[PDB]
mmCIF file of C-alpha atoms and ligand atoms in Angstrom:
data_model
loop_
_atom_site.group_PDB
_atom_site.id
_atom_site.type_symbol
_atom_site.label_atom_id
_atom_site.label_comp_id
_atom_site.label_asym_id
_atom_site.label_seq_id
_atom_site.Cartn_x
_atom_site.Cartn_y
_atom_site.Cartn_z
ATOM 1 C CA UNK A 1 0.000 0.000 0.000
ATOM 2 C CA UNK A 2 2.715 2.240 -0.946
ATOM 3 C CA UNK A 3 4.851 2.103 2.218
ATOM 4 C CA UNK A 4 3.861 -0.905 3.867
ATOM 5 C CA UNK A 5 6.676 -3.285 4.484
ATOM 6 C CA UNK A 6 3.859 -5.655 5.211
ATOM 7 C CA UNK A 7 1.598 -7.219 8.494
ATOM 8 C CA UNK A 8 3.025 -7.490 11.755
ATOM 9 C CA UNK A 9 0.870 -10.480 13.367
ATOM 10 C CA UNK A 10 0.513 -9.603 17.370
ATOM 11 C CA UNK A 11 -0.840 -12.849 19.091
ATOM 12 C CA UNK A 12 -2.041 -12.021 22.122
ATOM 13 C CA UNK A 13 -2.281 -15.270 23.994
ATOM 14 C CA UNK A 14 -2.899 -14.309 27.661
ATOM 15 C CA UNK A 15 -3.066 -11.826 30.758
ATOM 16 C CA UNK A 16 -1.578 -13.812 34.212
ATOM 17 C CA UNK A 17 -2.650 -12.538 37.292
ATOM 18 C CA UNK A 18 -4.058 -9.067 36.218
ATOM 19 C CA UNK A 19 -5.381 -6.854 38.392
ATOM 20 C CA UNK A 20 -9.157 -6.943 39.956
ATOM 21 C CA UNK A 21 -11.252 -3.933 38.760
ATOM 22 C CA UNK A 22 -14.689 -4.990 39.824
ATOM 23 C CA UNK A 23 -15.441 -6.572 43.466
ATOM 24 C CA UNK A 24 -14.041 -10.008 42.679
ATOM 25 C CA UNK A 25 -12.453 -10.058 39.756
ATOM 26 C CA UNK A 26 -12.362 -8.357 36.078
ATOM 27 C CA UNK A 27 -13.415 -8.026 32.275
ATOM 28 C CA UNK A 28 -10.356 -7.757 30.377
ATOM 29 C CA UNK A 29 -9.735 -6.615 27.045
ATOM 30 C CA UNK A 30 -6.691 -5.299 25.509
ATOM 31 C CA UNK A 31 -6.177 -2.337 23.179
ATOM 32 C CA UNK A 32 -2.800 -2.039 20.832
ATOM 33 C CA UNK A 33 -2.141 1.673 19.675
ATOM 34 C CA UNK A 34 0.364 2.027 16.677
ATOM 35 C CA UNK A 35 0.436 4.719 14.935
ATOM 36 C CA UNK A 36 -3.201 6.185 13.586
ATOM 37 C CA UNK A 37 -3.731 2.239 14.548
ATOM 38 C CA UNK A 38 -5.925 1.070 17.253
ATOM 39 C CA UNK A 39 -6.549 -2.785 17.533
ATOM 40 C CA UNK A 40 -9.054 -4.295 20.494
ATOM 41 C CA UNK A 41 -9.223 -8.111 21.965
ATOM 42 C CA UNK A 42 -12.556 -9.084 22.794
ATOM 43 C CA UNK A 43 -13.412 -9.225 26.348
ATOM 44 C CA UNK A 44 -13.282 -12.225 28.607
ATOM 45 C CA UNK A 45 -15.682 -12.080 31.309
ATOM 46 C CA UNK A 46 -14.470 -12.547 34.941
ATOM 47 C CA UNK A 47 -11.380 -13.957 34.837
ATOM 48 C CA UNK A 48 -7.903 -12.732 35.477
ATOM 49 C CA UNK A 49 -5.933 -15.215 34.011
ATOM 50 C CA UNK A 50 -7.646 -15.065 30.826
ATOM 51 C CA UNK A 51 -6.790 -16.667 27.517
ATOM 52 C CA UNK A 52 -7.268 -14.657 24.671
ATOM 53 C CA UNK A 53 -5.317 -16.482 21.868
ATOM 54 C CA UNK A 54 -6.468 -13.515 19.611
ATOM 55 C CA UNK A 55 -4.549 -12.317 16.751
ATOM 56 C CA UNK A 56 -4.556 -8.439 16.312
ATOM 57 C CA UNK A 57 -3.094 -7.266 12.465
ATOM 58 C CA UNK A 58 -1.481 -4.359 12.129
ATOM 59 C CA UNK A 59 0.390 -2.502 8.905
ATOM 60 C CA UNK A 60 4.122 -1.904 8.896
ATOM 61 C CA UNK A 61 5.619 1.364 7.260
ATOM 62 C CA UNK A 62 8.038 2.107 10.230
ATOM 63 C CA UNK A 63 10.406 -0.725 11.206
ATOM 64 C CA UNK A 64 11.112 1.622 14.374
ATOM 65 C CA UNK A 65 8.105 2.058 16.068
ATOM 66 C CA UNK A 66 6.469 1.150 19.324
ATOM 67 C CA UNK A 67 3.684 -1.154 20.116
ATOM 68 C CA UNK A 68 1.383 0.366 22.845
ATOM 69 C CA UNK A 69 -0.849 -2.216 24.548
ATOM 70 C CA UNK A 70 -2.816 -1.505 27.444
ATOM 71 C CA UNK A 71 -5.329 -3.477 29.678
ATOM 72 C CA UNK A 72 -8.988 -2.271 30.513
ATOM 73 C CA UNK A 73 -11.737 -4.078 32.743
ATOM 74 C CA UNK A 74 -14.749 -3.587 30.665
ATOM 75 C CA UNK A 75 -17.703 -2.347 32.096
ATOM 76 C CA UNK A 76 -20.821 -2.414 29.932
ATOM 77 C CA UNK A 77 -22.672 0.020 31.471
ATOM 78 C CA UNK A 78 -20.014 2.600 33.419
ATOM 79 C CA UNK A 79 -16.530 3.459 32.931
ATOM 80 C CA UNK A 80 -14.164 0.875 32.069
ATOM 81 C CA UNK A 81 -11.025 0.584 34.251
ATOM 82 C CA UNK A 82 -7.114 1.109 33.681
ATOM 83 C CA UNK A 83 -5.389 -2.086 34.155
ATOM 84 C CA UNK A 84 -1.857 -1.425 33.096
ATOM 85 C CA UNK A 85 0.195 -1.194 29.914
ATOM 86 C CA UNK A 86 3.088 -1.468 28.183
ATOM 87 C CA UNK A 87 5.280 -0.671 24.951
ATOM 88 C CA UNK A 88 7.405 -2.883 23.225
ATOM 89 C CA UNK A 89 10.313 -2.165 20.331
ATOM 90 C CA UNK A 90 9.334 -4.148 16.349
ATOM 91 C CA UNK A 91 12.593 -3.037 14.913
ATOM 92 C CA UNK A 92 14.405 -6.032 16.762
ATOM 93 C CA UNK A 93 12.179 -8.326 15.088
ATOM 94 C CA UNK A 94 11.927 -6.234 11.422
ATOM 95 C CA UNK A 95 16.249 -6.313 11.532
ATOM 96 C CA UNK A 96 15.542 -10.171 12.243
ATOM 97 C CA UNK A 97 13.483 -10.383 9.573
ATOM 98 C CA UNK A 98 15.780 -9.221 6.868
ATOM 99 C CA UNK A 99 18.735 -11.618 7.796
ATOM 100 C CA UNK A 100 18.215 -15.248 5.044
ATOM 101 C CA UNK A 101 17.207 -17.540 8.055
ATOM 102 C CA UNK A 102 17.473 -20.408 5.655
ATOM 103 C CA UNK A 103 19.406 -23.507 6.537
ATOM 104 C CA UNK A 104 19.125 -22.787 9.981
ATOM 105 C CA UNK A 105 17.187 -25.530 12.210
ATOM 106 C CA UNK A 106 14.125 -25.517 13.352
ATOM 107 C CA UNK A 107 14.711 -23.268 17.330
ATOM 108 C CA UNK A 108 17.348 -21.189 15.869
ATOM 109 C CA UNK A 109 17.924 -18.111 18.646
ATOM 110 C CA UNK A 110 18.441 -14.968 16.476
ATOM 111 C CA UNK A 111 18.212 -11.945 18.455
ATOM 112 C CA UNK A 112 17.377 -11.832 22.202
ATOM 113 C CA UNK A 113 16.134 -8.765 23.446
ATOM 114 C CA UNK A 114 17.012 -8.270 27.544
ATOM 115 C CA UNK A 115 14.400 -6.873 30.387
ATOM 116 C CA UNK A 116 15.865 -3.418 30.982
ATOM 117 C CA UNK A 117 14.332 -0.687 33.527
ATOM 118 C CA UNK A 118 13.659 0.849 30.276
ATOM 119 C CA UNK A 119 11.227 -1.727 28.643
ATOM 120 C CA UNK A 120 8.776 -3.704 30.087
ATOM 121 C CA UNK A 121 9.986 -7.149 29.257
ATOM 122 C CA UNK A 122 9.520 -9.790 32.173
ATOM 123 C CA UNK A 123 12.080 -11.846 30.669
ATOM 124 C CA UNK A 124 14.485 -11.641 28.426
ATOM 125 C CA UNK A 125 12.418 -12.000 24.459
ATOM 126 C CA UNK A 126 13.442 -14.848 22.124
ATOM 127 C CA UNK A 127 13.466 -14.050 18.591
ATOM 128 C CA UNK A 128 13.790 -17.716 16.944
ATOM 129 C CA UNK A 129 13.460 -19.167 13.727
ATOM 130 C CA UNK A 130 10.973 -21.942 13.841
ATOM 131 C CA UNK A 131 9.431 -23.899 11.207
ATOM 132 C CA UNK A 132 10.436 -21.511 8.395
ATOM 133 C CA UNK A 133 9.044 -18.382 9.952
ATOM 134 C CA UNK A 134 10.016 -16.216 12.607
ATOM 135 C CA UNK A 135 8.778 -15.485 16.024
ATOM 136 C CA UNK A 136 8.977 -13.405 18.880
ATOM 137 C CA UNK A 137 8.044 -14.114 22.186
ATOM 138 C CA UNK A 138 6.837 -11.654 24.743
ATOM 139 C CA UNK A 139 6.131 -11.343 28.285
ATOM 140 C CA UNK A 140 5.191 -7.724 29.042
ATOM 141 C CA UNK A 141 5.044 -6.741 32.837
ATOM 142 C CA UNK A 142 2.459 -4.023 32.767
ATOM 143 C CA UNK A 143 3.132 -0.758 34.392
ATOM 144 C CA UNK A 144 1.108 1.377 36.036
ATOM 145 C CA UNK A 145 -1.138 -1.395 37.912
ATOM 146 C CA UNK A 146 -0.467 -3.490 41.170
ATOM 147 C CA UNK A 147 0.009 -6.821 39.438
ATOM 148 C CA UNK A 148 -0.262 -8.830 36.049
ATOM 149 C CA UNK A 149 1.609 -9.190 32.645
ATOM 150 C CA UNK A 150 0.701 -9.983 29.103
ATOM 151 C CA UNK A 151 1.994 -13.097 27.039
ATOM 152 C CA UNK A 152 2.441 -12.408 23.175
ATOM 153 C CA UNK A 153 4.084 -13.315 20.097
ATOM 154 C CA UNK A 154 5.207 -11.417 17.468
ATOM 155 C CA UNK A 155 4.552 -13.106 13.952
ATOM 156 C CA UNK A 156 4.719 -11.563 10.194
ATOM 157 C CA UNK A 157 2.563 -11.849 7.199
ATOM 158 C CA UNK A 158 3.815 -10.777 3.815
ATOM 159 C CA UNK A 159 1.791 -8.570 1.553
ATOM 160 C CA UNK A 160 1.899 -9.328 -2.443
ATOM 161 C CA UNK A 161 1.649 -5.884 -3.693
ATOM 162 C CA UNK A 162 3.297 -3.858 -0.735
ATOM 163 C CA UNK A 163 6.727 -2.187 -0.745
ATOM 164 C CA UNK A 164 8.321 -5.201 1.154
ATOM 165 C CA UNK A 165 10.865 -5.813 3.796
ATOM 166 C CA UNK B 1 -5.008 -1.230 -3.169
ATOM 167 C CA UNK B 2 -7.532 0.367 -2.149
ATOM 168 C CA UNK B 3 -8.780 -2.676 -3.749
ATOM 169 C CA UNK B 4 -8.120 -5.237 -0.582
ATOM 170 C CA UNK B 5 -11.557 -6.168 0.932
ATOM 171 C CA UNK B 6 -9.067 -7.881 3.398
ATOM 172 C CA UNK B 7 -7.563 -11.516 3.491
ATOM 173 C CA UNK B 8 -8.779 -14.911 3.945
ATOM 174 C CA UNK B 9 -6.967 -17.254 6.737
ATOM 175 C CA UNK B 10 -6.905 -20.256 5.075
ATOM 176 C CA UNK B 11 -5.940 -22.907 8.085
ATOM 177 C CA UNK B 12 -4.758 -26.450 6.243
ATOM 178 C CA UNK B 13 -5.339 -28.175 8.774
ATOM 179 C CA UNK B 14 -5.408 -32.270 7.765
ATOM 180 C CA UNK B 15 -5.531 -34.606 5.104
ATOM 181 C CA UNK B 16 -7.577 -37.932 5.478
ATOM 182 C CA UNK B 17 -6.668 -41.250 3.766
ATOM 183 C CA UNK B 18 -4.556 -39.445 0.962
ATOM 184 C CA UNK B 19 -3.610 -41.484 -2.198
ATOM 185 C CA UNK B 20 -0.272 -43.330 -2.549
ATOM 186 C CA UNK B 21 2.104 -42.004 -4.873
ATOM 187 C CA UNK B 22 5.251 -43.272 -3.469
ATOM 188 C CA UNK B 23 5.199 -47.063 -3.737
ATOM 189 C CA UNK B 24 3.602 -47.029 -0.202
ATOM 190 C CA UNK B 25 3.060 -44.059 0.948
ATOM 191 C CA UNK B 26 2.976 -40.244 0.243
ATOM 192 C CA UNK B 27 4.844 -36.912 1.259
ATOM 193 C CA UNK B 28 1.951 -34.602 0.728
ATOM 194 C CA UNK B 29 1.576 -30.702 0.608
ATOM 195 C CA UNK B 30 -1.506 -28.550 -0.017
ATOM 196 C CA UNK B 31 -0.981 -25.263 -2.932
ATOM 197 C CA UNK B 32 -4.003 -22.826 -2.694
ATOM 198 C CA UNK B 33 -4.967 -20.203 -5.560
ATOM 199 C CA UNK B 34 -7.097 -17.386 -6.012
ATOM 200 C CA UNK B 35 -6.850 -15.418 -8.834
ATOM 201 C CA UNK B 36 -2.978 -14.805 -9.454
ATOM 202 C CA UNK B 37 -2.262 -16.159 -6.178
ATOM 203 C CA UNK B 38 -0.871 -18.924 -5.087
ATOM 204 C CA UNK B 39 0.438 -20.281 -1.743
ATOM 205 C CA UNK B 40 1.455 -24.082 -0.428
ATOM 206 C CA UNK B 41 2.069 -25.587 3.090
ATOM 207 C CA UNK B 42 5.194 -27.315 3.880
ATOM 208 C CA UNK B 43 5.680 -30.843 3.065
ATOM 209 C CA UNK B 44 5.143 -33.851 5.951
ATOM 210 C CA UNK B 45 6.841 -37.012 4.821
ATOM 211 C CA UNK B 46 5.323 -40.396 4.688
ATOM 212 C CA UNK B 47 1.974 -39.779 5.437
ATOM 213 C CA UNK B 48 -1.175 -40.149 3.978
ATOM 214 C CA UNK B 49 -3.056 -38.697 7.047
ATOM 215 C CA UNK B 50 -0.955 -35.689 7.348
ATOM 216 C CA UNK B 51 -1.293 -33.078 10.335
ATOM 217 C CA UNK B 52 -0.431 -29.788 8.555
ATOM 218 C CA UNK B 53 -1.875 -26.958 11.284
ATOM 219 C CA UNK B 54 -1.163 -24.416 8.692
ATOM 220 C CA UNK B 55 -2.261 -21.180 7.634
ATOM 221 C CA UNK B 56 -2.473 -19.906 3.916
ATOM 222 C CA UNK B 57 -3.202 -16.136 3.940
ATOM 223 C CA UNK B 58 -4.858 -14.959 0.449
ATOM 224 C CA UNK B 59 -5.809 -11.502 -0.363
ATOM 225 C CA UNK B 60 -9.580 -10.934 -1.293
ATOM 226 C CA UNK B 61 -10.911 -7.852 -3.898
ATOM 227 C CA UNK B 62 -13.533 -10.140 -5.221
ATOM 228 C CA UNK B 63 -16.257 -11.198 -2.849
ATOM 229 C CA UNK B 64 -17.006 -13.376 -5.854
ATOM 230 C CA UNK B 65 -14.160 -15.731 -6.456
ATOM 231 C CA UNK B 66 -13.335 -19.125 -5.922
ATOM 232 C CA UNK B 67 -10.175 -20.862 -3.998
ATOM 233 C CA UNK B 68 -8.406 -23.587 -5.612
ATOM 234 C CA UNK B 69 -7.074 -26.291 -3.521
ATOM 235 C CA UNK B 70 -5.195 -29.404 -4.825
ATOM 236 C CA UNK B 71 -2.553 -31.991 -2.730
ATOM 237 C CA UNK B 72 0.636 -33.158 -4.359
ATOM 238 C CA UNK B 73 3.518 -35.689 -3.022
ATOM 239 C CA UNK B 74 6.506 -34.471 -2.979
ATOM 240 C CA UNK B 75 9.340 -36.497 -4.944
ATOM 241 C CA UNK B 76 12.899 -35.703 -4.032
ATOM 242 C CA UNK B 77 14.377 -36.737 -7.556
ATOM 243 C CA UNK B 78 11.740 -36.517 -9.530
ATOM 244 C CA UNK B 79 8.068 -34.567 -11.128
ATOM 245 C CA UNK B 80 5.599 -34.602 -7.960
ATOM 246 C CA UNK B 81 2.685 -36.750 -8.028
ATOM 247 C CA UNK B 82 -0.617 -35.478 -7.667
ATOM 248 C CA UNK B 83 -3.174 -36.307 -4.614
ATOM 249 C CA UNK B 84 -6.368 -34.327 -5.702
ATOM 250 C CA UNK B 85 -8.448 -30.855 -6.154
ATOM 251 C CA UNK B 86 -11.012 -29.310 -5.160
ATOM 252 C CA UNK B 87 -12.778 -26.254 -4.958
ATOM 253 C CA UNK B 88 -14.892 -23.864 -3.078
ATOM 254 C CA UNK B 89 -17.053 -20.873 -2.409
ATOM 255 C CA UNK B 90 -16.248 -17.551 -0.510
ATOM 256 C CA UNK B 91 -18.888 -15.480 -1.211
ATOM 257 C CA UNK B 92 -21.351 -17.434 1.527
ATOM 258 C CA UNK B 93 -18.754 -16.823 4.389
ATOM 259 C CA UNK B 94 -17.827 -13.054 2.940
ATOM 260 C CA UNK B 95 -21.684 -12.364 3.109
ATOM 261 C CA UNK B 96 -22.186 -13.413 6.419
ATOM 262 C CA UNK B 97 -19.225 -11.825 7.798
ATOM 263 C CA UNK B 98 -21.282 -8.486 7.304
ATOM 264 C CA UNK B 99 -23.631 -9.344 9.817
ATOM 265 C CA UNK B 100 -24.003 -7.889 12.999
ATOM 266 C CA UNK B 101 -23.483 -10.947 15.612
ATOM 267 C CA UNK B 102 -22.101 -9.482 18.587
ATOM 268 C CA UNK B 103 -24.555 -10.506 21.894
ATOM 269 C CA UNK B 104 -24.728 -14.118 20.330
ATOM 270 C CA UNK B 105 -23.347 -17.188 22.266
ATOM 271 C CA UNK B 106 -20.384 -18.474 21.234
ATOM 272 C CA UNK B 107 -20.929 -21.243 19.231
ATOM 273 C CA UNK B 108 -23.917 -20.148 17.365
ATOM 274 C CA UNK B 109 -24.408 -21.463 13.684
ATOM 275 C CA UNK B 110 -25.122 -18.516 11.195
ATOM 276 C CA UNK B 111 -24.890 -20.440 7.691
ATOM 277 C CA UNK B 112 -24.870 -24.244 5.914
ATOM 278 C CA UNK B 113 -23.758 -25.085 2.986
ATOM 279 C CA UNK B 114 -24.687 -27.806 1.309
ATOM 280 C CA UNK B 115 -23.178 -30.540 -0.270
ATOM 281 C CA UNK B 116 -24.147 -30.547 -3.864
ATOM 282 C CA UNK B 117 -23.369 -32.681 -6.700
ATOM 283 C CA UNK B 118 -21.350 -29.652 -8.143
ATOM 284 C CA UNK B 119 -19.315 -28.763 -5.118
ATOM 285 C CA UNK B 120 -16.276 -30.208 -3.376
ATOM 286 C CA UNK B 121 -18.391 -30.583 0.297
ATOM 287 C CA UNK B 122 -17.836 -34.194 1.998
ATOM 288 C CA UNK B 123 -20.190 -32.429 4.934
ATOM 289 C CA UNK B 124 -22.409 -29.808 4.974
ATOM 290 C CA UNK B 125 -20.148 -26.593 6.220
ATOM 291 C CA UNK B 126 -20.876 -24.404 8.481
ATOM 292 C CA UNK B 127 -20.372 -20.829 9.434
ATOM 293 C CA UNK B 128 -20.181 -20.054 13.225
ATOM 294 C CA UNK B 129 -19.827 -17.638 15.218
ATOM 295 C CA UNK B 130 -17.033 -18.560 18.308
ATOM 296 C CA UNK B 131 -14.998 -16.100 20.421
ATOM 297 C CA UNK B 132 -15.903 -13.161 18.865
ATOM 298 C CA UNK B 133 -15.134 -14.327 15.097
ATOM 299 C CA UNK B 134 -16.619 -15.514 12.086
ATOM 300 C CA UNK B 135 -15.403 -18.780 11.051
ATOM 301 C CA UNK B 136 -16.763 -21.142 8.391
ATOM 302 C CA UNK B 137 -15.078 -25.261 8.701
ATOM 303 C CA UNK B 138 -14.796 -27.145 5.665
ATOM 304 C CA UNK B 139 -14.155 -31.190 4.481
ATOM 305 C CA UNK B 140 -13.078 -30.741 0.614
ATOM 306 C CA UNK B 141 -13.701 -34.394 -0.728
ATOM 307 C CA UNK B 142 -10.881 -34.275 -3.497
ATOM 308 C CA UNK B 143 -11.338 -35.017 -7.026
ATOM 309 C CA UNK B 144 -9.996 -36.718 -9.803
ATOM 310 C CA UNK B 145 -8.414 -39.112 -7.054
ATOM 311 C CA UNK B 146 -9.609 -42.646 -5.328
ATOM 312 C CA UNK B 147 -9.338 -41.222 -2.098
ATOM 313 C CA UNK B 148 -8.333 -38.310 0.263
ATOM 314 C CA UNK B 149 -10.574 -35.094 1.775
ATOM 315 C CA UNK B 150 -8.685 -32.162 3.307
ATOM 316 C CA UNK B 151 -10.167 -30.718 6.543
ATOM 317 C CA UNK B 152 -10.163 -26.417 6.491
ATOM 318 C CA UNK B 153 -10.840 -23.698 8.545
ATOM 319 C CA UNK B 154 -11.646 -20.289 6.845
ATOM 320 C CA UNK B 155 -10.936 -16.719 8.944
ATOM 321 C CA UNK B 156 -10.979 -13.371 8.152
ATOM 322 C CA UNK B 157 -8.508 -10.514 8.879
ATOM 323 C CA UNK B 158 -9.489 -6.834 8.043
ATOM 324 C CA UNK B 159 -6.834 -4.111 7.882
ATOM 325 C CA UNK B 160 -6.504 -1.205 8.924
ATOM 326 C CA UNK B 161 -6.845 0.757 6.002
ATOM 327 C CA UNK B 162 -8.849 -1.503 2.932
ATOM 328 C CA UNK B 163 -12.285 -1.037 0.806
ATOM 329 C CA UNK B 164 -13.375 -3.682 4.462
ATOM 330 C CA UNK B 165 -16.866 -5.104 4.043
HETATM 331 C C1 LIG C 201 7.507 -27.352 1.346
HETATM 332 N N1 LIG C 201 6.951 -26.566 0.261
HETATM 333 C C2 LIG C 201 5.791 -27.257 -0.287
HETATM 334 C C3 LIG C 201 6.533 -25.248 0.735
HETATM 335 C C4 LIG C 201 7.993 -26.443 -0.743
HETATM 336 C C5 LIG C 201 8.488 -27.719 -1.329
HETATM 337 O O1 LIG C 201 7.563 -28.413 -2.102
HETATM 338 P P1 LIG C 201 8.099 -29.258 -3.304
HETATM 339 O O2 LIG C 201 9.609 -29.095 -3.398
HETATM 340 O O3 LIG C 201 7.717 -30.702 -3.124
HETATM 341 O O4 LIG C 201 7.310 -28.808 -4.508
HETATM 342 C C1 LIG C 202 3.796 -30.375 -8.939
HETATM 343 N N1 LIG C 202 4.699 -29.606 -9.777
HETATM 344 C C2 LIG C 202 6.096 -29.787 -9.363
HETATM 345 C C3 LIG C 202 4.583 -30.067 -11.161
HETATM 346 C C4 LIG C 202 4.310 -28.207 -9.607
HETATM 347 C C5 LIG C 202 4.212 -27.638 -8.214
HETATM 348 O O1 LIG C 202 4.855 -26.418 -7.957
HETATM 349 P P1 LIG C 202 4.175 -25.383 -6.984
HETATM 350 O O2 LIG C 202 3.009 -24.731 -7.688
HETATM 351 O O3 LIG C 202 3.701 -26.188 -5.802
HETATM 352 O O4 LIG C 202 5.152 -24.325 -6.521
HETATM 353 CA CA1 LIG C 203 -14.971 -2.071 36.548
HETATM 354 CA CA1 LIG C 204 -16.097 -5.356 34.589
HETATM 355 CA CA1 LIG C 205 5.827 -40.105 -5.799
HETATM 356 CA CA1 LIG C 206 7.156 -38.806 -2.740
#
């Protein structure tokens, strides 16, 4: 689309222990800001730990931008809730993607990316080639909330038409 | 484009009793086409019940087209056997992915299609709504073959950006 280097897949797999926001427990749902971009998970009702396994698609044209995701307890009639958020760097994973991963096995490390006070990595993120394609796991520590963190995965889908990696 | 309604998720997921083409056996992958495009799974060896788990991700600017889908064995050292075609619809999932759904249980079944004399259907297919998404799951019986269906699961993804639906 005259830019786009293509689709940067953000699997959003699950929140652990997130933070209660009504009584007992919460309705989570998360929203990723990149950009003019704003993707939503649908909400899981009452449940902290919940699994999402939702893929969110967004369009590259920067390799060096940030990821916003943030947390909200969904409340269908009142407010809905801050709980947390975090930002993570792409243009690890774009460099990684330009790099002819071919020949190398299956659980290939390729870049690791290491928690700093900076960025709100839990661990230390894996960049590996797997099956032909390459992946990034995530755990984001949220900020700005007593508790929880977000499990993703970083995959890409290539665009016939786009301007490419 | 500006012309991108958005693309189609094509999960490969298995093939059923698949023909021979190897003396005893097969090494069987599944190529996809619609319009100019084409895509193809990776290739499991020896296995004529193959678990492929794969997605296939096709870009859609005509509601009204058609997907291709044939199997081939892979031969090391030599032209690769064929295992099959088939065919099928988009429009029926395209049109119901307009409607308005959300409040419905997960689960819900929005559209059948038939099996029909003219298309590839081993089972009627249906459209459901689960987990917030549209989804329709298919069993291609393949032609021009003795044996062998391929099991499919269809998704959308909308961009930001597109015509949409
Ligand atoms: C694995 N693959 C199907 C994507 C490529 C190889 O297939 P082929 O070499 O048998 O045609
Ligand atoms: C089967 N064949 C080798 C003759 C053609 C397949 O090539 P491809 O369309 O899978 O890339
Ligand atoms: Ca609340
Ligand atoms: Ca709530
Ligand atoms: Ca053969
Ligand atoms: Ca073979």
């Amino acid at each position: 689309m005259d830019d786009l280097l293509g689709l940067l897949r953000i699997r959003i797999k699950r929140g652990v222990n997130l933070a209660v926001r009504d009584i007992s427990s919460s309705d989570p749902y998360v929203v990723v800001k990149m950009g003019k971009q704003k993707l939503k998970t649908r909400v899981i009702n009452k449940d902290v730990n919940p699994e999402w396994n939702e893929d969110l698609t967004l369009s590259v044209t920067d390799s060096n931008l940030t990821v916003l995701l943030t947390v909200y307890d969904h409340d269908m009639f009142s407010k809905d809730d801050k709980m947390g958020d975090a930002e993570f760097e792409i243009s690890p994973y774009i460099e990684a993607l330009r790099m002819q991963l071919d020949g190398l096995p299956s659980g290939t490390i390729v870049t690791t990316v290491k928690p700093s006070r900076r960025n709100c990595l839990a661990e230390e993120s894996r960049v590996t080639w797997v099956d032909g394609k390459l992946v990034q796991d995530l755990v984001l520590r949220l900020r700005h909330v007593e508790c929880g963190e977000v499990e993703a995965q970083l995959q890409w889908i290539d665009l016939p038409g786009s301007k490419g990696l």
